[PDB]
Amino acid sequence: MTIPEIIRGERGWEGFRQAELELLQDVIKNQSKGYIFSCGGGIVETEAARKLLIDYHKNGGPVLLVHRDTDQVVEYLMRDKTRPAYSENIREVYERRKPWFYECSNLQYHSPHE
Ligand SMILES: O=C(O)C1=C[C@@H](O)[C@@H](O)[C@H](O)C1
């Protein structure tokens, strides 16, 4: 089943975050070398997932953070009709997540001429 479909059923956001954690757990040990992975946007707000990322980049890593302007990243997600009414504002999510991304990141890259 799909990700938005998981959000609707008994799973919700509760089970979805542990669905990520178990895949990340499995990927880190099994697919340990020779891959490049795009993680979820909110992987970083599961406490146990942060421990895995931090533990990974403390002994070799690497874990790359990509962060465009905080205005332009917002308008990409605001321009997306799939978004429940009364759900979290993107400003407050990005600002709460920012310190966790840094903590969980080994490397950093932003385009010098965006
Ligand atoms: O902003 C987020 O927390 C998410 C971003 C997407 O990559 C998906 O992981 C999901 O829609 C949640």
Which range marks the domain in which residue 77 is found?
1-114
**Distance between CA atoms of 60 and 106, rounded to whole angstroms?**
9
Please, which residues bridge with residue 64 across strands?
Answer: 107
Residues contacting residue 66 through CB under 8 Å, at least 6 positions apart: 109, 110
Coil, strand, or helix at residue 27?
Answer: helix
**Distance between CA atoms of 88 and 113, rounded to whole angstroms?**
31
Total domains in the fold of the chain? 1
Residue closest by Cα to atom 3 of ligand 1: 42
Coil, strand, or helix at residue 62?
Answer: coil
Distance 77 CA to ligand 1 centre (A): 10
Distance 99 CA to ligand 1 centre (A): 18
**Residue from 3, 24, 92 whose mutation best tests the ligand 1 pocket (most atoms within 8 A of CB):** 3
Residues contacting residue 101 through CB under 8 Å, at least 6 positions apart: 44, 65, 67
Query: Solving technique for this entry?
Result: X-ray
Nearest-Å Rg of the Cα atoms of the chain is 15
CATH number at residue 80: 3.40.50.300
**Distance between CA atoms of 34 and 51, rounded to whole angstroms?**
22
Phi, psi for 98 (deg, rounded to 5)? -50, -50
**Distance between CA atoms of 71 and 53, rounded to whole angstroms?**
27
**Distance between CA atoms of 15 and 17, rounded to whole angstroms?**
6
**Distance between CA atoms of 77 and 83, rounded to whole angstroms?**
9
CA nearest neighbour of 17 among 26, 27, 7: 7
